[PDB]
Amino acid sequence: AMLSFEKKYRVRGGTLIGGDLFDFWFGPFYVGFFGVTTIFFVTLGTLLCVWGAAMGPTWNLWQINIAPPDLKYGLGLAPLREGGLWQIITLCALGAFGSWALRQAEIARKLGMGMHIPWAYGGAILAYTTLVVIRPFLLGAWGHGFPYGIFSHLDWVSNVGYQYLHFHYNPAHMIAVTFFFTNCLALAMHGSLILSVTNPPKGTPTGTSEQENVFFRDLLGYSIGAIGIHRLGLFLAVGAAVWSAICIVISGPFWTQGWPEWWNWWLNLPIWK
Amino acid sequence: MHRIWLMYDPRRVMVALVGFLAVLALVIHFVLLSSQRYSWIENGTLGADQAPVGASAPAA
Amino acid sequence: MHRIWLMYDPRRVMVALVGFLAVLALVIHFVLLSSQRYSWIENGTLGADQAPVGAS
Amino acid sequence: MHRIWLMYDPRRVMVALVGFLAVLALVIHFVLLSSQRYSWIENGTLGADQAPVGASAPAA
Amino acid sequence: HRIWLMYDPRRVMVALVGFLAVLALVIHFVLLSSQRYSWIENGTLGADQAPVGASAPAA
Amino acid sequence: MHRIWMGTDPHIIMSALGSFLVGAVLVMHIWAYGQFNWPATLKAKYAT
Amino acid sequence: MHRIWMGTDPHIIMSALGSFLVGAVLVMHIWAYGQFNWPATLKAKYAT
Amino acid sequence: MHRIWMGTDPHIIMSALGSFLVGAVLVMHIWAYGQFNWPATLKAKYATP
Amino acid sequence: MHRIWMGTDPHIIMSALGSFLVGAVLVMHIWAYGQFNWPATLKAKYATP
Amino acid sequence: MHRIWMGTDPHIIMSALGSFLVGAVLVMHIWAYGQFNWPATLKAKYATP
Amino acid sequence: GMTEEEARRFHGYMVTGTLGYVVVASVAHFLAWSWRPWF
Amino acid sequence: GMTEEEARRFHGYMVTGTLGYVVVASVAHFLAWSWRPWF
Amino acid sequence: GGMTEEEARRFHGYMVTGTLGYVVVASVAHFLAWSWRPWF
Amino acid sequence: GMTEEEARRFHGYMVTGTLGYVVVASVAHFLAWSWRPWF
Amino acid sequence: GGMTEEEARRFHGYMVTGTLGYVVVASVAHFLAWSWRPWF
Amino acid sequence: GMTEEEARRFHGYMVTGTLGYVVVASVAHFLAWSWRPWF
Amino acid sequence: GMTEEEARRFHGYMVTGTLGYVVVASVAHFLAWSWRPWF
Amino acid sequence: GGMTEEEARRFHGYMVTGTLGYVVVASVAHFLAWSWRPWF
Amino acid sequence: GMTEEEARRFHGYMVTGTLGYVVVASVAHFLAWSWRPWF
Amino acid sequence: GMTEEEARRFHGYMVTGTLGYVVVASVAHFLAWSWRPWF
Amino acid sequence: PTAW
Amino acid sequence: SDVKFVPADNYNGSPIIPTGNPMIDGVGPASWAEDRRDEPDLTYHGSHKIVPMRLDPTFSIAKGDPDPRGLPVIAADKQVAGTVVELWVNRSEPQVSYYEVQLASGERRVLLPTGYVQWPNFGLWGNDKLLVKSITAAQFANVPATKRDDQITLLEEDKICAYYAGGHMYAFAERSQPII
Numbered sequence A: 001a002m003l004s005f006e007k008k009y010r011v012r013g014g015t016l017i018g019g020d021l022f023d024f025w026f027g028p029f030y031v032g033f034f035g036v037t038t039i040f041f042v043t044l045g046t047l048l049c050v051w052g053a054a055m056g057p058t059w060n061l062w063q064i065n066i067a068p069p070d071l072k073y074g075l076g077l078a079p080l081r082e083g084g085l086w087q088i089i090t091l092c093a094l095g096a097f098g099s100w101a102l103r104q105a106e107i108a109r110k111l112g113m114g115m116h117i118p119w120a121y122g123g124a125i126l127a128y129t130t131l132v133v134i135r136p137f138l139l140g141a142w143g144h145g146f147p148y149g150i151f152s153h154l155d156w157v158s159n160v161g162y163q164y165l166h167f168h169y170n171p172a173h174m175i176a177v178t179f180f181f182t183n184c185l186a187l188a189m190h191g192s193l194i195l196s197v198t199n200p201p202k203g204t205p206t207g208t209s210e211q212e213n214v215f216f217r218d219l220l221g222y223s224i225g226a227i228g229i230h231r232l233g234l235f236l237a238v239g240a241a242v243w244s245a246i247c248i249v250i251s252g253p254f255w256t257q258g259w260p261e262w263w264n265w266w267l268n269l270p271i272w273k
Numbered sequence B, D: 001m002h003r004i005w006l007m008y009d010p011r012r013v014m015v016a017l018v019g020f021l022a023v024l025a026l027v028i029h030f031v032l033l034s035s036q037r038y039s040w041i042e043n044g045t046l047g048a049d050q051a052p053v054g055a056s057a058p059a060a
Numbered sequence C: 001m002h003r004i005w006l007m008y009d010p011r012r013v014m015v016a017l018v019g020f021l022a023v024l025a026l027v028i029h030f031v032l033l034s035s036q037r038y039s040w041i042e043n044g045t046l047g048a049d050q051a052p053v054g055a056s
Numbered sequence E: 001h002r003i004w005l006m007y008d009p010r011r012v013m014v015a016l017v018g019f020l021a022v023l024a025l026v027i028h029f030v031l032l033s034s035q036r037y038s039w040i041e042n043g044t045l046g047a048d049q050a051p052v053g054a055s056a057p058a059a
Numbered sequence F, G: 001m002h003r004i005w006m007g008t009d010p011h012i013i014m015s016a017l018g019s020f021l022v023g024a025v026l027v028m029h030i031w032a033y034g035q036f037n038w039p040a041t042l043k044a045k046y047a048t
Numbered sequence H, I, J: 001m002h003r004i005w006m007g008t009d010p011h012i013i014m015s016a017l018g019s020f021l022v023g024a025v026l027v028m029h030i031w032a033y034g035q036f037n038w039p040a041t042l043k044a045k046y047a048t049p
Numbered sequence K, L, N, P, Q, S, T: 001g002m003t004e005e006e007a008r009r010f011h012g013y014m015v016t017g018t019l020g021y022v023v024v025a026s027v028a029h030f031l032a033w034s035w036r037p038w039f
Numbered sequence M, O, R: 001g002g003m004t005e006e007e008a009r010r011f012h013g014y015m016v017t018g019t020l021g022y023v024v025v026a027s028v029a030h031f032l033a034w035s036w037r038p039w040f
Numbered sequence U: 001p002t003a004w
Numbered sequence V: 001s002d003v004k005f006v007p008a009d010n011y012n013g014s015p016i017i018p019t020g021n022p023m024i025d026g027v028g029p030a031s032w033a034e035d036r037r038d039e040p041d042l043t044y045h046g047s048h049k050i051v052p053m054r055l056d057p058t059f060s061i062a063k064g065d066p067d068p069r070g071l072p073v074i075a076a077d078k079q080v081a082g083t084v085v086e087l088w089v090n091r092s093e094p095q096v097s098y099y100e101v102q103l104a105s106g107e108r109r110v111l112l113p114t115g116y117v118q119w120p121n122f123g124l125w126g127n128d129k130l131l132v133k134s135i136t137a138a139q140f141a142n143v144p145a146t147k148r149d150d151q152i153t154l155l156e157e158d159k160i161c162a163y164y165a166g167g168h169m170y171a172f173a174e175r176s177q178p179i180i
């Protein structure tokens, strides 16, 4: 099925790889070559996750836990029942996420859109790749990755934080948190403003960009304007993921002590040492 | 039975088939390689009298 | 039999095929490379009777 | 034979080739440097009988 | 010689120099991080005094 | 029997045959050196 | 029987037949080397 | 009975039969080598103590 | 016989042959030095006690 | 035989030949200094007790 | 769009490809069985 | 779109290349099997 | 496309001849092998 | 694109390029083997 | 598409011939197999 | 692609080369057999 | 805009510069080897 | 632009002459090698 | 590029240089052998 | 754009600047070597 | 009862 | 024959194929919202939102920025398409919505949306020609005209913007094909 205006947009062309070969739709979905590789990796990864659940102690969704190998295996593939399965699933994940971003690029090219969406998603892929590839590689063992399990990965997050005694004191983490919180505030204001001009109280005329601009300017003192708020929301949301990648990659590979004692440089500035 | 190729585009049924078989084959090989009885890469040279067999606890 | 190339443009298959086989060869080598019996970079000189066997 | 270069742009294939070979060469050197037997920057001066070897199977 | 028709020298020269600059810097820091070739700290050791990695144990 | 070469390219045929012979000869020699205990008896004859 | 070859590219036939024989011959030799204890007896003849 | 073949490309028929026979023959030999203790007696004859 | 060269280029041919000869000669020397115990006898002849 | 140089650049030829010789001669010297125990005997002659 | 003639032709290759694949698979299973039975 | 004689020409190369690759891979397995059998 | 009835008829002659040549060489091989190490 | 003669001459360089590369690698492997063999 | 009855009628003759040939060889193989190692 | 006129001329060299190669191998095996016989 | 003259001239500089660099680097390795050999 | 039949006929004469010279030098080298250290 | 009548002269000098180089090396080896013979 | 007259003139200032820098740098290295050799 |  | 496209084949998810020039007919990435209201956008006070700067005396260029007027426009084939001769401004949120380009190869002036112009060196220096990657210098001659030269309807905005958007697929034949 198609939207009432959709058919004239369903042209050939805009692919990166494969040409006409996969240039077709399946229901709502665009396929393409990277659609085919997406489904391959998604399917292989998901079934290996189900296999991980089957050989683990429970089918309880919250408790399934496919763990990485012991650190002793270093950068090798471990035995599959001893964490090698987590490694194969990680390759499927990297393939699925990369295929998704390239399929987004093919869709955007077909619609004559800018490449903003694929690159914005690249921010999230960077954080995932930091957690399971880059940081474990810098530490010299794949066993530093997080386990695949809805709550067991939260146990990993807890323990990694307390490896540095007081992870709130990590300076890149403070920035990352500030971006996440500021993003959520900005999203609530942008949503509210557009809705409040487009859905005014009954019997009021539809609002305008001028009213939105005036109100916003009483909130922050300055006008952000229409393109400015979308630049800001993109800067905040993607910057949050980039600073997250920074805050975790410096924890271990570069800083090994507790995070509170990193702040010793501030106490010893020569003006007040 | 050849009317299948009138209902569906054969160019892409066949991609779906090859994809499905490839995924299925890889799943089965990784499952067997996870097992004890069929970890052929490390225990493949054992004869069947030496090959692992799983059992429950003896429940005395 | 040749008519599959009227369905699939061969120049667009062959690039896909090479990628699949390159990844598959890399996967198989790494699976072997970190097995005990076939970690040839470190135990390749052993000879077949001395090579590990995954008995337990 | 040369009609392969009529199917594909030679410029693209050269960039694809050199990229693959560079990454492959880097991976293999890293795998060797990361091993025990071939960590040549530290142990390259050892003779072939004193370089590490991975353990054998047990006697029984 | 016609490869230079396919690639602009103004690009190629910088790309080649950038590759060599990175590769040289990588090799120096890899050596400097080793024990045998940590030459800033230990370069005055003789070749018999310089570190060597561990051997096969034979037992 | 000659006309099986019709429609072929001789530089391909010689490329294929040449590669096969190089491969077969090297495979045969490394195999033969394993079985025949040579050059091992040469290296034994000149040793310290 | 010859009309079985109609419609057929002869180079595909020689390619397929040739590859089959290589596969068959390699399988048969590796098997036979196992069963007949040769070149194992050859190796023991000249080993030190 | 020859009318059976009329719908068919004879090369597809020969491909199908050729596939079946290679399969059946290999299955039968793998099976028979298990039951008849051969080549195991051949191997033992020439094996080394 | 010479028809084998027709349509080739001399600089291509000499590059191929030249690289092959360099490779084969170097391999054969590395191998031979291993098997023949030379220069290992030469080095032992002049080595300082 | 001289036609083999047609289409070449002589400054490339001398550049390749010159660089090959420098490489080969250095390799040959450091090899030969290893085998012949020279200048190691030279140093030991004039070295201080 | 392919005719019922082309559909019948295509189906013949598809059947013989399937059969040939199923034969290779069955030989592989019998080798696997004789090596290490699962029942 | 490719003509049937172009498809037939490519098919001969594609079969031959595939079978040549499979032949080389079979020799590689023969060497690997001789060095360290997996069954 | 492919071989005509004529080309097939000619091809078949060489094909049969090559196959018999192969069988003959193999028959000699088995006779020698049998004399060297009988298997039944 | 490219002319079949221009393809023909390019291929000769790509072949001899690949050959020279294989040659150096083969010597490098024999040196490595002579220093610390892996089988 | 496919075969006429005329070529089907002659194809059948080769098919029957080849089948009976294969059975004859197989019959000899079983006679040898039986006299070597009877299985009942 | 070779014509059958070319194929005729080519085939005579190809046969001569093959037969000569087998002669040289035949000598090599005779020398090898008299040096170290393998049956 | 390239020409075959510009290309041929630039090729000479790239070849000679590359080889001169490899010469200076070969001496650097000679010095490094004499100070602390890695084999 | 590829080598003509006459250039090939000319080239082939030098190519053979070089090859024969190379084999001749190697023949002397192996004779000297054999008399220095026989390998069979 | 270089014409035949340049190449004819280039060959004459290139041979002359090579012959000189081999002569100097022959004296070097004669001296080296008289100093430390290696067979 | 740039003339050869400027391009040649400019290269003269580059060389003298470079040489002056390398002369100072090599004096600085030899001073450092005299104070605390790194080999 | 650790084993059969 | 007036339907702008046909299915590539009869299967359910198949693409359409344009029957004419898709940049002009408006198919694929060249298509526009054909039902869109053919009236000008209006400010809160009811004046025309988008007007040439020449017709509102309160507007001016910011002192630190380049004045685009008089700069040449460089098209996708690197040829000069024309020169900028006027700016159109949005009066609700003060910004430049369009350049108006006097074509070099004819008598037309055409609108060029700001989102299709790149400045050299990302605007960090140079600032002396405009780069239009989307369409070739010949294709500028078919940019859709506005009915008037002092105002633009929401339909004309959609047609003009869609025309440049289509050029990223249709300006050269190679742009539609895969990179590998």
Ligand SMILES: CCCCCCCCCCCCCC(=O)OC[C@H](COP(=O)(O)OCC(O)COP(=O)(O)OC[C@@H](COC(=O)CCCCCCCCCCCCC)OC(=O)CCCCCCCCCCCCC)OC(=O)CCCCCCCCCCCCC
Residues within 6 Å of the ligand: A001, A002, A026, A027, A028
């Ligand atoms: C954690 C907190 C934050 C968590 C935050 C999570 C937010 C998730 C928001 C998105 C969820 C809805 C996605 C969606 O709407 O997809 C379109 C599809 C179809 O409707 P349509 O698009 O309007 O019409 C098209 C269709 O009718 C005809 O299309 P066509 O013929 O071309 O294609 C074939 C059909 C076949 O239909 C299907 O395959 C539908 C299968 C949907 C399964 C997934 C449901 C997930 C519900 C999650 C909410 C919750 C369920 C409990 O259509 C399609 O092919 C459409 C494919 C759509 C694929 C969507 C995949 C979304 C997967 C999301 C998974 C989220 C996991 C969290 O919709 C549906 O089928 C029905 C969805 C109804 C809304 C969910 C409400 C659930 C309320 C509780 C149960 C109510 C019971 C009465």
Ligand code: BCL
Residues within 6 Å of the ligand: F004, F005, F008, F013, F016, F017, F020, G011, G012, G014, G015, G016, G017, G018, G019, G021, G022, L016, L017, L019, L020, L021, L023, M018, P014, P015, P018
């Ligand atoms: C015209 C080119 C034809 C061809 C026509 C012939 C002819 C004619 C003959 C053979 C023969 C052989 N073919 Mg055939 N063959 C081709 C493709 C192949 C392929 C393949 C991967 O495509 C394979 C595996 C084979 C395999 C074989 C061997 C059984 C045998 C050659 C020795 C050998 O061990 O080669 C192993 C093979 C490979 C590793 C593949 C690449 C190298 C081969 C040798 C190239 C084939 C052409 C070569 C010049 C044949 C020379 C034969 C002499 C004139 C006697 N051929 C192509 C498509 N082939 C001969 C035979 O039947 O001997 C019993 C024979 O007389």
Ligand code: BCL
Residues within 6 Å of the ligand: J011, J012, J014, J015, J016, J017, J018, J019, J021, J022, Q016, Q019, Q020, Q021, Q023, S017, S021
């Ligand atoms: C445009 C000039 C040509 C050239 C022409 C010559 C000539 C002519 C001679 C040499 C010689 C030599 N060349 Mg030069 N050579 C070139 C480029 C190089 C390159 C390079 C990286 O490109 C290298 C490594 C070499 C290397 C070498 C040595 C093998 C050798 C001794 C001098 C030396 O070390 O010079 C290192 C290289 C340089 C400093 C740059 C090249 C130019 C300088 C001026 C040196 C060579 C000329 C020399 C002084 C002439 C002496 C008189 C003659 C003996 C009659 N040449 C350029 C492309 N070369 C000599 C030889 O064969 O001795 C056995 C010799 O007679």
Ligand SMILES: COC(C)(C)C/C=C/C(C)=C/C=C/C(C=O)=C/C=C/C(C)=C/C=C/C=C(C)/C=C/C=C(\C)CC/C=C(C)/C=C/C=C(\C)C(=O)O
Residues within 6 Å of the ligand: B021, B024, B027, B028, B031, C001, C003, C004, C007, K006, K009, K010, K013, K014, K016, K017, K018, K021
């Ligand atoms: C271990 O734990 C878990 C995993 C959980 C256990 C459970 C596992 C489960 C549930 C498994 C289920 C398996 C399954 C279920 O059905 C499996 C079913 C498999 C099937 C059907 C396979 C079919 C294969 C068919 C093939 C290969 C055909 C190939 C055709 C070819 C090569 C011909 C190509 C040429 C053509 C066409 C000619 C062109 C002519 C043209 C164009 C012309 O003429 O125009």
Ligand SMILES: COC(C)(C)C/C=C/C(C)=C/C=C/C(C=O)=C/C=C/C(C)=C/C=C/C=C(C)/C=C/C=C(\C)CC/C=C(C)/C=C/C=C(\C)C(=O)O
Residues within 6 Å of the ligand: F001, F002, F003, F004, G010, G028, G031, H025, H026, H029, H030, M007, M008, M010, M011, M014, M015, M017, M018, M019, M020, M022
């Ligand atoms: C160990 O345990 C297990 C494994 C279980 C034990 C059991 C094993 C089993 C069951 C084995 C079965 C084996 C078998 C069964 O069939 C084996 C069958 C083997 C066969 C058939 C071999 C055939 C060889 C044929 C050859 C060499 C032909 C060469 C032809 C040539 C050279 C001519 C080429 C064409 C020309 C010149 C035409 C020119 C004109 C042209 C082109 C024109 O005119 O157009």
Ligand SMILES: COC(C)(C)C/C=C/C(C)=C/C=C/C(C=O)=C/C=C/C(C)=C/C=C/C=C(C)/C=C/C=C(\C)CC/C=C(C)/C=C/C=C(\C)C(=O)O
Residues within 6 Å of the ligand: C025, C026, C029, C030, C033, D014, D017, D021, D024, D027, D028, D031, E001, E002, E003, N006, N009, N010, N013, N014, N016, N017, N018, N021
């Ligand atoms: C840890 O162990 C693990 C890693 C896991 C184990 C696994 C290992 C695996 C799986 C390895 C795989 C290896 C592999 C494949 O698969 C390897 C494949 C290698 C290949 C193919 C190499 C090819 C090299 C070719 C080169 C260098 C060419 C050089 C020269 C060129 C190009 C010409 C220059 C001149 C030009 C251009 C001008 C021409 C004229 C022109 C233009 C004119 O005149 O117009």
Ligand SMILES: COC(C)(C)C/C=C/C(C)=C/C=C/C(C=O)=C/C=C/C(C)=C/C=C/C=C(C)/C=C/C=C(\C)CC/C=C(C)/C=C/C=C(\C)C(=O)O
Residues within 6 Å of the ligand: F010, F017, F024, F028, F031, G025, G026, G029, G030, I001, I002, I003, I004, P006, P009, P010, P013, P014, P016, P017, P018, P021
């Ligand atoms: C250890 O355990 C295991 C491995 C199991 C043990 C078993 C191993 C087995 C089973 C091995 C089998 C090997 C085998 C099988 O057949 C081996 C077969 C080998 C063959 C076929 C060799 C053929 C060589 C042919 C040569 C050298 C040809 C030279 C040609 C020349 C000189 C002329 C070139 C053309 C010219 C001059 C002009 C053309 C005209 C032109 C261009 C024009 O006119 O234009």
Ligand SMILES: COC(C)(C)C/C=C/C(C)=C/C=C/C(C=O)=C/C=C/C(C)=C/C=C/C=C(C)/C=C/C=C(\C)CC/C=C(C)/C=C/C=C(\C)C(=O)O
Residues within 6 Å of the ligand: D025, D026, D029, D030, D033, E009, E020, E023, E026, E027, E030, Q006, Q009, Q010, Q013, Q014, Q016, Q017, Q018, Q021
């Ligand atoms: C240690 O552990 C790990 C790291 C893991 C181990 C592994 C390491 C690995 C994998 C290493 C790989 C190395 C490698 C692989 O390729 C290395 C390759 C190196 C290369 C290619 C070097 C090439 C250098 C070339 C140079 C310097 C050129 C200089 C040219 C000059 C000076 C002239 C400039 C010309 C001009 C100005 C033009 C004028 C005329 C003009 C303008 C006109 O005429 O118009």
Ligand SMILES: COC(C)(C)C/C=C/C(C)=C/C=C/C(C=O)=C/C=C/C(C)=C/C=C/C=C(C)/C=C/C=C(\C)CC/C=C(C)/C=C/C=C(\C)C(=O)O
Residues within 6 Å of the ligand: I025, I026, I029, I030, J010, J028, J031, S006, S009, S010, S011, S013, S014, S016, S017, S018, S021
């Ligand atoms: C230790 O273990 C291992 C390492 C294994 C042991 C084994 C080692 C092995 C196998 C070594 C082999 C070495 C070898 C093999 O061939 C070595 C070959 C060496 C060669 C080729 C030497 C050649 C020297 C040439 C010279 C000096 C030329 C001088 C030319 C000059 C001065 C220029 C004159 C003017 C000219 C030309 C043009 C004028 C221009 C004109 C007129 C114009 O432009 O118009």
Ligand SMILES: COC(C)(C)C/C=C/C(C)=C/C=C/C(C=O)=C/C=C/C(C)=C/C=C/C=C(C)/C=C/C=C(\C)CC/C=C(C)/C=C/C=C(\C)C(=O)O
Residues within 6 Å of the ligand: E024, E025, E028, E029, T006, T009, T010, T013, T014, T016, T017, T018, T021
């Ligand atoms: C310790 O561990 C690690 C760090 C890892 C180890 C490794 C380190 C590594 C890899 C180092 C690499 C170093 C390197 C590699 O290349 C270093 C290269 C250095 C270089 C190239 C230096 C060059 C300097 C040149 C200078 C200063 C020139 C100055 C010119 C001047 C002033 C003149 C200006 C013009 C004038 C006045 C007038 C014009 C008139 C005009 C126009 C007119 O009059 O018209």
Ligand SMILES: CCCCCCCCCCCCO[C@@H]1O[C@H](CO)[C@@H](O[C@H]2O[C@H](CO)[C@@H](O)[C@H](O)[C@H]2O)[C@H](O)[C@H]1O
Residues within 6 Å of the ligand: F007, F008, F009, F012, F013, F016, G009, G011, G012, G015, L008, L009, L010, L011, L012, L013, L016, L017, L018, L019, L020, L021, L024, P001
């Ligand atoms: C190295 C790994 C990959 C394997 C490489 C290939 C190894 C085996 C090569 C054996 C020789 C194959 O020989 C090749 O056969 C094909 C068909 O099969 C011939 O025929 C093919 O090309 C020719 C010429 O364009 C066409 O007329 C013909 O229709 C087409 O089938 C080729 O002209 C010949 O060169």
Ligand SMILES: CCCCCCCCCCCCO[C@@H]1O[C@H](CO)[C@@H](O[C@H]2O[C@H](CO)[C@@H](O)[C@H](O)[C@H]2O)[C@H](O)[C@H]1O
Residues within 6 Å of the ligand: G023, G026, G027, G030, G031, G032, G033, G034, G035, L026, L027, L029, L030, L033, L037
């Ligand atoms: C399709 C292409 C296939 C290419 C070949 C790829 C490898 C597959 C080989 C399958 C055949 C294996 O064949 C089998 O080899 C083993 C190797 O231990 C032999 O085993 C026997 O001989 C070997 C020596 O060779 C002894 O070390 C061993 O103790 C003994 O059991 C078997 O007696 C033989 O039956």
Ligand SMILES: CCCCCCCCCCCCO[C@@H]1O[C@H](CO)[C@@H](O[C@H]2O[C@H](CO)[C@@H](O)[C@H](O)[C@H]2O)[C@H](O)[C@H]1O
Residues within 6 Å of the ligand: J023, J026, J027, J030, J031, J033, J034, J035, Q026, Q027, Q029, Q030, Q033, Q037, Q039
């Ligand atoms: C292309 C430029 C290459 C420059 C790289 C230089 C390193 C490569 C050397 C190639 C030559 C063969 O390698 C040569 O081996 C001998 C030993 O046999 C080395 O000899 C060295 O090690 C031995 C121990 O083995 C020490 O006792 C000796 O004091 C020392 O000189 C030579 O110094 C080295 O040059």
